[PDB]
Amino acid sequence: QMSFTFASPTQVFFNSANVRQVDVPTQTGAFGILAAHVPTLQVLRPGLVVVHAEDGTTSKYFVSSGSVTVNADSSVQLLAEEAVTLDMLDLGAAKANLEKAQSELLGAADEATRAEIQIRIEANEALVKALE
């Protein structure tokens, strides 16, 4: 059975728990881990993890980036760099930053600058989608 472990650098949400399902967004498209998933190791993207406790409960945490590792013996390590529960986020401010980033996108001094800017657009769009 699973051995979930979902820890931010500051706080730790689950530590060697036993959950039913973990829906995680990764760089190569979202997916969902269950008891005996095939071993993998992906790198997250700004999205929202959804954990289903052993019972029917469900909880959402918005992860910004990190790494998910599904191990051979049904032990998931999901380390996010900054995992915040949805209630801590601001809807309007996310829209404001999305619009601002869309603004600065035009002043693409160099492809690296455009990359960072529209990574910002990507993350803010993920935020608004999560909060809408």
Place this chain on the structure above:
Amino acid sequence: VAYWRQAGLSYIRYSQICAKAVRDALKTEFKANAMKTSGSTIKIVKV
């Protein structure tokens, strides 16, 4: 191979930027606590 890797970035920079985008969109009070436990103070001495 994402675009930012086509532009020569690294996943550390991508994670930095995404974390910033998530941090500047918290309820106001939380932002204060987010200023702690975040943001570097290290300096690099050129060799």
Place this chain on the structure above:
Amino acid sequence: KQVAGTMKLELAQYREVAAFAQFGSDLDAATQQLLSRGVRLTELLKQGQYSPMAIEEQVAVIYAGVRGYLDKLEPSKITKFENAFLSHVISQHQALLSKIRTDGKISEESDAKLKEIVTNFLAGFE
């Protein structure tokens, strides 16, 4: 007696953690409060030269100091507060000072009057 018992107790507490005064930060909240109150009280005990003060003036000033009504003011401004507040009470409020002087004690009504006076003057000081 009433005001000086508390002032002396607080100063004694402040003298045994005055070594940390330099560090101050990176210490518990109780020590921070002790340092702050002690600094305010010491800045209060400062006096000019050849400018003695009647007992009512002294008790009013120390009462303002030791009840926390200066925990917001910056220490550099306490010497100016003391002066302005003292001139205020000496001019506007003579009945309360006379009551304290002749009576010799701080009656409950006089305590309330001092509370309101200190708050009203401190309410806008800038």
Place this chain on the structure above:
Amino acid sequence: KQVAGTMKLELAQYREVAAFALDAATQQLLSRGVRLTELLKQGQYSPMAIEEQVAVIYAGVRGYLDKLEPSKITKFENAFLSHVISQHQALLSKIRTDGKISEESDAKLKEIVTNFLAGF
């Protein structure tokens, strides 16, 4: 008077930052101070003529010994004295008689020290 003044300033600065032992400027300051310090040592019953003292102190204070190790400064001092007392007796006589490091005397001193340092 000309040379010992700069030496006095250099030792005065050195004595301040001496209790420890980074940057190039202060590292070189300590180096110069130490070179001058080992320059001032002496033996017993072997007093020096004033012009010889001037020669040694000039060599030490004009950044020449800063290349050498500080444990070898005595060797330098001694060998330099022995070399000058014979080859360049004329320059020492000039310094004694005229009682100052004239421009030509300074240029000579310069070339003698530059030659001797490498040749040692």
Place this chain on the structure above:
Amino acid sequence: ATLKDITRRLKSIKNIQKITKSMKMVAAAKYARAERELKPARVYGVGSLALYEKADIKTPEDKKKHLIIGVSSDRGLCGAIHSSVAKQMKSEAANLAAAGKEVKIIGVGDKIRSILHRTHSDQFLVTFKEVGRRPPTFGDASVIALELLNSGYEFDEGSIIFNRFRSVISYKTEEKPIFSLDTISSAESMSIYDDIDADVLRNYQEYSLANIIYYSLKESTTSEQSARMTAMDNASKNASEMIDKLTLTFNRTRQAVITKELIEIISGAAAL
């Protein structure tokens, strides 16, 4: 010495003792905070290391590029914290170079740089200062990893040396291996992991590097604060013993001076 010499020395030692007591208190507070912040980072870093100890990765025995990272701080007065780390770093560097490798060094903290600036002065890939002023964050580890990757020393094997915090009185120096994706790709234990090209694995390696550096930072700062508390306590105790001895000497000297002056007066009076 004379009475004034003893008086000045006694006053100086009393000031020193006061200062060391205050610093012990400050270090104890910072230690409590550091332990509190170390628990979650402990679980986080252990998780981040989970993979390598679960899929046993043996470093290739045919590569010459190695990296040594040594985590410490700028602050002194912490006892044998920087000393142990630097000693083990030079031990490992000597072993690697004797095995015919090409070692570099990253120094997180001045004191490490200083201890190793006489020998190994040329192997410094880059060093970081301003450590220890404030508790380390994930931002610091991200910056260290970013400047490690940007500086194009593509290493073939790695090691990080930090003072693992055991208890308030004890700590241990560890060496946690760091791998480059060249070693992860060509590992047969890694053949089981699915959906793994050589790009996702590269992002994963970069993140794991940041993770291990952050873990080491938290452990090192906790151990350093504990050691500073202990060192200040011992220094205050030594200053107290010295103060006792000097107070005894001062009392003897004060009485002797009183007697001497009085005998001088008596002799003058009786010699008229």
Place this chain on the structure above:
Amino acid sequence: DPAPATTFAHLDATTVLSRAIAELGIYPAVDPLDSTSRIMDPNIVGSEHYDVARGVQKILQDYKSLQDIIAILGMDELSEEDKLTVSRARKIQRFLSQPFQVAEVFTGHLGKLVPLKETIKGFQQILAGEYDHLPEQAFYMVGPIEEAVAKADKLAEEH
């Protein structure tokens, strides 16, 4: 000692020259904290003069208090406000030095006479922070503050 101790009571002003300050090269070695005057009151000299003097004395005493800590921590570990106090204190310590017209032989410099208003202005500015960028040595053995600015300019040019 009984002789100076008794002499203290017969004097209006005293200027206690100190050896610990003469070793540092600050000349005249007058000790700023161990010297006093009777006229040193706000009603005789003025409130500006008095406040400048008391600010200088307070900053020097705070510097003395800090020197005990710097002997253990080190300068690198002080609160970024304390380093400001130490810098101001060292600038003020150097700025009190002055070249005399009779000490030309020793220093080789030239004597300066500083009018009172210029001294008050110099110290008020040094305390107010209007010079917290010039290096310390710029203030050593100069007259009015503008001479310190000029000396700093020369130091920078031949840097």
Place this chain on the structure above:
Amino acid sequence: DPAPATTFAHLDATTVLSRAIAELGIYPAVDPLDSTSRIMDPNIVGSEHYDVARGVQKILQDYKSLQDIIAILGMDELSEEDKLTVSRARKIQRFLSQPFQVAEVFTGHLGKLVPLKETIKGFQQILAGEYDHLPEQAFYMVGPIEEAVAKADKLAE
């Protein structure tokens, strides 16, 4: 005191036995820095003898300078050159101790005489650093230095 202070001016060589050094266990407790002599001249004793004596005195004086800080801040707040100086100075302090024959009854050791050449050679070796791998307690109460090496070997067992 007036008596010893006056006697000092009537002697060629002095040897100031010290109670602190005797409390450290060193014996004879001669204080190497208070003791002096008129014939400590490179023109009388030599250049190796004179150089070795001055090197020993210099290192002992450096150690004395460090002692005050070492006592409070601990021997961890020292540079590496200073730690080397402390180690060499302690080795030299111990090595100056010697077992006398008149103290055979006291301690049961065997009295030792140390010819001058052996003394100079042993201190040269300690100063150069040839014996930095030995434990400082390998020099305590031995004759020539080779006995210190033998003692250190026995300590390993």
Place this chain on the structure above:
Amino acid sequence: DPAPATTFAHLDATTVLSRAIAELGIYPAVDPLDSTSRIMDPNIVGSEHYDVARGVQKILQDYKSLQDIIAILGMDELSEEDKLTVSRARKIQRFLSQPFQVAEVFTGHLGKLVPLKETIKGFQQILAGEYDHLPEQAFYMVGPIEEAVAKADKLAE
């Protein structure tokens, strides 16, 4: 100093009133640890009295040492065989206080003249642990131990 150096030659005991204990409200403010006696000897005061006194002194010293740990590492760091000693030492400190008959206008209580057997039994019982279930304040400013029991009953009920 010759004055106390000469008087101390005659003293057969010592009592040390301390400002640091009158602050705590303990009275008489006699420093339990700094106080000394020559007849605190099992041959004079008997074995039971001596053992009780030594146990009380040891536990008070233990609490004094533990107070540093409490101040620095916080109360949580204690064991369960040390929190118990802290509690017992606080109870002992409270029980060492007493109400005086000549101070009934300062304490509102009635003065007690505790015989010796009562004192020894009370402290022996407290050390044994027979009263670990009571509150500390039940021991403050009371006479024999039975008064502490009655105070506990009166304040808990």
Place this chain on the structure above:
Amino acid sequence: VRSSAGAVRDAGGAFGKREQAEEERYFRARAKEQLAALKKHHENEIS
């Protein structure tokens, strides 16, 4: 017998010289930095 401020440098023992040097080295460094900045400002303000 008491202790007073600024006593470590009054004794002049080892701690006094150590503190004096720890101060002098730091302020020489800062003076060098400030002189460099002053030269830069001089050059940048000629025009």
